[PDB]
Amino acid sequence: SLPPDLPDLDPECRELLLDFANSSAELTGCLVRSARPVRLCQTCYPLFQQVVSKMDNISRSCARSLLMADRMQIVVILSEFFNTTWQEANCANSNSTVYFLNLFNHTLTCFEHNLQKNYSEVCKNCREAYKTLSSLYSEMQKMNELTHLCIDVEDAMNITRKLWSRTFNCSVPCSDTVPVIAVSVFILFLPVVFYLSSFLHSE
Amino acid sequence: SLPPDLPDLDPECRELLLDFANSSAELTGCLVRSARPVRLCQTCYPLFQQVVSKMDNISRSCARSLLMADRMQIVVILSEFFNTTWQEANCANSNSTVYFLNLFNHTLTCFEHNLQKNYSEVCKNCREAYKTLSSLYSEMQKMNELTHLCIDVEDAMNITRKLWSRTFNCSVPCSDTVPVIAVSVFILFLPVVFYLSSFLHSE
Amino acid sequence: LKYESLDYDNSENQLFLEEERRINHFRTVEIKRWVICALIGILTGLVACFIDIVVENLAGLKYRVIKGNIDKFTEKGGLSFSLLLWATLNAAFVLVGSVIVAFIEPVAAGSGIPQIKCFLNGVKIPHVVRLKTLVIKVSGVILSVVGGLAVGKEGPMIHSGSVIAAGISQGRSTSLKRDFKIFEYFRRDTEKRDFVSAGAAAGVSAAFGAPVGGVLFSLEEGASFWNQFLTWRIFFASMISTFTLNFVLSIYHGNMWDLSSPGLINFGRFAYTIHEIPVFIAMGVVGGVLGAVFNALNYWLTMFRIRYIHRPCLQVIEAVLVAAVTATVAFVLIYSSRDCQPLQGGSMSYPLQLFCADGEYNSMAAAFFNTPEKSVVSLFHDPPGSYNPLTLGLFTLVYFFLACWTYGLTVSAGVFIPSLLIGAAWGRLFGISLSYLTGAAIWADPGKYALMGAAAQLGGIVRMTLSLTVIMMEATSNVTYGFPIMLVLMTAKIVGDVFIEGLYDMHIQLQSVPFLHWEAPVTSHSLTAREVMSTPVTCLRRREKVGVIVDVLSDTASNHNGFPVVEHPARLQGLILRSQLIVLLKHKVFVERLRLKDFRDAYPRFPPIQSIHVECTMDLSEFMNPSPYTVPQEASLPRVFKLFRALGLRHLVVVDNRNQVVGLVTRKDLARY
Amino acid sequence: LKYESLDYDNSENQLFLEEERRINHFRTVEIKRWVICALIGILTGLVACFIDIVVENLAGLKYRVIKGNIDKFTEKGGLSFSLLLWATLNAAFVLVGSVIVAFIEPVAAGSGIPQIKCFLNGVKIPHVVRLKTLVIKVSGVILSVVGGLAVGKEGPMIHSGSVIAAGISQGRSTSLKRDFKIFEYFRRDTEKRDFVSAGAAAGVSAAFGAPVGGVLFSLEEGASFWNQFLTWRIFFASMISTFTLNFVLSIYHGNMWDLSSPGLINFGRFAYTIHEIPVFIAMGVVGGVLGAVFNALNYWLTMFRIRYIHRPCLQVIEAVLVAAVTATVAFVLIYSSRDCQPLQGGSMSYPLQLFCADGEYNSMAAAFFNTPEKSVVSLFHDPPGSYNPLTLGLFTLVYFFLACWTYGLTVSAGVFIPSLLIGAAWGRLFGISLSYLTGAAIWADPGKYALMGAAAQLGGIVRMTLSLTVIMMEATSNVTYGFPIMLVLMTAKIVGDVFIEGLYDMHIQLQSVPFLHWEAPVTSHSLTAREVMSTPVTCLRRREKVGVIVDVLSDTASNHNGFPVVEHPARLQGLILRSQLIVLLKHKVFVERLRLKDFRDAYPRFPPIQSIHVECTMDLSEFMNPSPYTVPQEASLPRVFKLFRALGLRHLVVVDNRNQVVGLVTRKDLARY
Ligand SMILES: *[C@@H]1O[C@H](CO)[C@@H](O)[C@H](O)[C@H]1NC(C)=O
């Protein structure tokens, strides 16, 4: 009155599958929650470890009967999907990141600290608050050069670059137009002297 | 004291993202739950529709600011992943499927109804309970011919084929060995007559 | 004494030299050649798709009857009443396919390549170009492949694409109903070989997928002087035939925006290191040796077949028995298989289940029920661990002897694909063995060795080096793999030439065709070109009489086709040949009017002198060519041979110091060495 | 009267006929040719990687200085002190690269193809094969590409791969230090051209990736009689050079198990319907017309350059001014751009930001800072909507005139890649316009039209049909695309031939090289081959004296290189030429001993008779060839021309009816038509 394993599994492995279920649903929930501002990397770092740990535990019988039972191996697909999303985001995180976040928080508070059209306001004060931030950003690309480096840092710098240009007209004045016309029209004047002077040296 | 949309979103779109979150976490949970026996197609059909509906609602402003805000568009990726898993499973469901399920339930009850080694038991009774099931299965492949047809049906027939052969030795006896030796050794005997008779017709 | 040669030189007369002045006075003679070289490729692509559409539907009719027959004679009584059905179905097609060849004409037997690389060479084999040969060959390869025999279909595309080349180039249709007054100026040779070269290079591309390989094939055999315009038309006629084969089959299958399936055989898409470069050389030697076993015992068979079975009543019976044994050996070999695998994808076209568990399918019924091309592609591209290495052994050891015993039959099919299949079979079987003695991390993928066994086996069986490296490079669509393949085929020739000759050369030497080949032996370098001639010359002076030339043509003891003219003791002032001479005697041109076109009349066939009943004298000036290609004596044979071959010559004439004819060198003198 | 011809015939003597009997008595003369044809490809692949490794490191040194210079002269004062820096950095390299050519030897100027398809033809241009030309050309193309000019680097690979072909084939190194006693029997012509043919077909494959295109190139120019063995060595020497270029660059970059980057230029991986077959023909006509504007006004420039700037002091200054204007026009054109795009991937090698928002980068700084090959690959493979169609207009309309004004300079670089880039530029610009007037669903992808504009522009500028269709088929790795490309290049020749000649033909006709080309004009078909000869013949009888042959060699008023021998009034018993004759006078062979090797001594250069100071008689038998290729009179010119060209002949001799010499046809007589 008992087929061994083919219709039903033992009640010694089903709680493992329910535990992986409880992990994966909540991981998808936290991962989904981050919106336009991306805080997923910095908020779903603890519960990403547990899912992987659970997968390793299941992997370590009760591994042939539970992920080589059929086509459409759904546990391997979910795990694989999480692994793929994690690698392309490329978190690798934390002190430097924390410092950058603090700077971003500070830099952003000075905008509404000096806010109130007429965007020609006292924002010259935020100039030295702005530029060094971007300078640090370039230095951070020199640190992770030896591709996108993260997603918290990229979006945080993206928001500042979107605010700095296309809603606050913060353009830089230009000083040099007449020298880069004079030098260019002087250098483009030597061939019409050269060929015409070599033509008239036939006597 | 208010940047318009770049650091934060309005509180008119965040509840939509939370609703999609609540949908997607529970969909992953139900989808993950099906184990070796695959009942996902027949248990997660209602809440698969709602996720799609929610996606359409979000898609139908509050579509540029919410899924074209960054690289790693995570809402589009989750939705895309669900769509991909759904299509390759290829459910397309329901009356025929229900009938097949009922037959499977019936066919399987006769095994433990007649169970008790010594698998030479009264299982001849289940022979006409078995074969027509497989016959119906072949007919079902004639219905969805104009590739795998489902996952509930495939696994349900897979379990019966695993039980019928490699744990219950239910082989069929063979009757024909001497005719398929006699006819073969007769047909492989005509060339050695033919060449030798054409050789000796030289006089 | 039966195979007379082909004239490639244009014997310019005063009539030709006046007619070419007439036609030149808007330069519309070359723009009429591009039309023929355009619609010589469309008409070959349509034949190549007409074979492919018919043969798969007839195979789909024939195999589903059998797999529906042995699904009901399982679970019940005997299977022998289905073995008899598959034997008689493989006999009933090949009965008709052997009767329509063994009785009407024997020229369509075998493949088409050895009868077309001798015409290309200049030997007019009897018949061959006639429409009846085309109709019986293209309806003999359909009826034999579906008949069930181990023969390829990409063989007879060259001959079938060469017959329609020299049939629409003339615009005559000499059966009846002349069908045109168009396409004069082409009713001569020096156009016949120029369009057979464009026809035969439109069958190599339309059967393999390599357009640039076809031109090298037609050049390799066609060893004439290099002229850019002719090659630039052979390339244009080759490129059409792989476009009007995609565009018809893609309309046939599905949407027209998928231009795959470039020819009748389609290798897939397709990484190696330097450290296994010796290993590929160690394959090629094997590819010689087994090749020289395939190419040798067939010889010991073929003379037996030419000694006792030389009559049409017996070879039909012998083809029927080959088909019945080919059925029965395959049925015994799939009846006793123990290796069964679960199906996946489209790896089995007609799945067969007997004596196997439910859901799984027999794996020995693969590579007998599906086509050879699909099995060869599956052997190139399957992932590892997919073949049981006992299946391939018993498959190769049977299919080798069947493909050896089947070739040389009186049916019409080729030998390309039953060489690639054997080569890929033992190539993958050798590639598995490099995985069961190492870890086989990356560099022991059997997809490479299944390729470079199939490249080795062709070079072992059919010695063909330059025109085969290119068509193995173009069909694989990868130029990185061009270097080991060249290194394999180079080996498998110079190992196999020690033992036995080519496969396409035995079927030329066993019919006593002259067939002079490029270059000359270096051991015979100093023959000094006076030994290699016929010493007396039956030349004829200009304007003697009529009875002299009648008694020099009508003579049973000797057949000579070319006669040089002399003057005064002799001068060698040009030569006159039999065709022109009996044209002049068919009219009355005795000195006691006509244009160039009169000579062209009844060009294919010239009436013999016994029908030319019935003195005066005729003036042979303005009917001869005033400058034959002459050579002196005292000259080396290598130089004489090169000159004769490199141009197209039927009658070389040797002279004296004072320009006196002393001998005539023809083709059969140079061929004997 | 300066360009003397090349002897391809082996004038067999009794000494040659005895020495070849001596060497033949284990057949070790041909197995020594495969060693040269093996290591003639390795030595070309190593030059082709030595250029590529050096030029990208020097470009990486040169451009990062500039992009670090205009990142600090933004945000502050002027940019003109960086424009002057980029002008003087583009002037300082090309100063040395023009001095080392305009003063030492002018033969290395331009590309290498018109000086090597005339040697292949049989004309020994002065110098050219000397080591010094190799050293100055391979160190002049590095110093000019990084110098900053609109010139390709895949041009001079043919000449640089041809010089090392005829330098290790001899084993002499005639500078000093003879370096071998090995590799005699090759110190003659009929081996010189046979190894230059294998060298020049190892530079076409090593620069484009097409091995089977290189053999068709070397055949197309080399119109000799077809012999399989020689082509089967040219193919073997071509296949090596694309394997010792993968195997070195793949060691250089990363892991050795990635055998991509098949040559110096690498097209990518790569679907069309019948309904756009006319559209591609409508591209090819455009490819003629703009081609005939590129190929015409350059002509009006080049004679100006040959009329007034014909001295080494001025053309160095003129190359420096071309480099400075090429800097300044590009800097003005990127200073005023308004189109800026966000970066992605590796589409910009050196990203430049000036006057743009943060994060985004200027798009006009692309296609000036990166290499031309990377820009051409990016134009083939970018997804749609990636280029602003105002950028490509102002880029093409400048780069066309710069590539026209730069070619013909006294620096050493090619013109291939500045034709593919222009062709792909207006091809993609034409492909965008088929999307802004339809919906552009599937069939209006600009990746096709960017390919088939680049194929059209080459046929418009460099008329080359058969050897270019194949190398556009092999580098694209797709045989479905072989049919429209052939249909484009066929059009763009017969539209462009109406207006002006080729680009490689003007630089042959403007140096008065004879250069007879394949075939003969059909308007001059009846010249009857007696008008085309020199009527008096200064022949010399055998065994007269010594003062006769001294006074027939030493004569200022005429330079003749070949003399036929006569007997008794004349017999034409063979011919003797100057090299052998002054070898016999350098020794004392007067009839009052030596082997074949004596003639070979001082083979490259023969001392003039004025240094041969100081009767008796000498016997010219056993020093002449006893059978020249003679023709009679009365013969058509097409026949005479074909015979002369198809074999390799320096001295055709016409005769009489009674075998009397009446004229001698040489190369300059046939060339004038
Ligand atoms: C999921 O985990 C939470 C937290 O440990 C626990 O409170 C809850 O009971 C679990 N639910 C399931 C279904 O296992």
Ligand SMILES: *[C@@H]1O[C@H](CO)[C@@H](O)[C@H](O)[C@H]1NC(C)=O
């Ligand atoms: C693995 O599962 C077992 C049994 O449920 C549990 O006792 C253990 O803590 C788990 N270990 C890990 C690493 O998750």
Ligand SMILES: *[C@@H]1O[C@H](CO)[C@@H](O)[C@H](O)[C@H]1NC(C)=O
């Ligand atoms: C049937 O079950 C077997 C047991 O592992 C599995 O390998 C196979 O993929 C299953 N087939 C189908 C059609 O689900």
Ligand SMILES: *[C@@H]1O[C@H](CO)[C@@H](O)[C@H](O)[C@H]1NC(C)=O
């Ligand atoms: C992802 O897969 C890779 C390769 O198997 C493995 O090295 C890595 O640990 C995985 N990472 C996660 C987060 O599962």
Ligand SMILES: *[C@@H]1O[C@H](CO)[C@@H](O)[C@H](O)[C@H]1NC(C)=O
């Ligand atoms: C982070 O820690 C690393 C390693 O100790 C140290 O090198 C670096 O200076 C730290 N950076 C910050 C921002 O504290």
Ligand SMILES: *[C@@H]1O[C@H](CO)[C@@H](O)[C@H](O)[C@H]1NC(C)=O
């Ligand atoms: C930003 O700074 C404020 C004020 O100190 C603090 O309340 C808040 O938590 C900070 N937020 C972040 C993201 O660091």
Ligand SMILES: *[C@@H]1O[C@H](CO)[C@@H](O)[C@H](O)[C@H]1NC(C)=O
């Ligand atoms: C902008 O604000 C400045 C500083 O408060 C003030 O001086 C000026 O009048 C304002 N201009 C406008 C256009 O409101």
Ligand SMILES: *[C@@H]1O[C@H](CO)[C@@H](O)[C@H](O)[C@H]1NC(C)=O
């Ligand atoms: C999710 O939906 C359930 C069922 O409607 C509801 O009870 C619950 O409050 C929701 N939770 C969230 C986080 O929206």
Ligand SMILES: *[C@@H]1O[C@H](CO)[C@@H](O)[C@H](O)[C@H]1NC(C)=O
């Ligand atoms: C879409 O969202 C709105 C606002 O939350 C809600 O009122 C409506 O019911 C939703 N419709 C669908 C089809 O989900």
Ligand SMILES: *[C@@H]1O[C@H](CO)[C@@H](O)[C@H](O)[C@H]1NC(C)=O
């Ligand atoms: C920055 O934001 C823009 C706005 O749409 C988005 O297009 C882009 O992908 C973002 N870039 C990064 C690096 O996240």
Ligand SMILES: *[C@@H]1O[C@H](CO)[C@@H](O)[C@H](O)[C@H]1NC(C)=O
């Ligand atoms: C999946 O995507 C396809 C193609 O866009 C669409 O037709 C289909 O409705 C999607 N299905 C689901 C379940 O989202």
Ligand SMILES: *[C@@H]1O[C@H](CO)[C@@H](O)[C@H](O)[C@H]1NC(C)=O
């Ligand atoms: C299911 O419904 C279809 C359509 O009405 C009908 O054709 C078929 O017979 C039904 N099958 C079953 C098992 O009820």
Ligand SMILES: *[C@@H]1O[C@H](CO)[C@@H](O)[C@H](O)[C@H]1NC(C)=O
């Ligand atoms: C199987 O039948 C039993 C008994 O009628 C019933 O209790 C059960 O719900 C059925 N199960 C399925 C899967 O139909």
Ligand SMILES: *[C@@H]1O[C@H](CO)[C@@H](O)[C@H](O)[C@H]1NC(C)=O
């Ligand atoms: C098997 O069961 C049958 C039927 O109950 C019984 O007759 C027989 O003795 C049993 N055999 C064994 C080996 O237990």
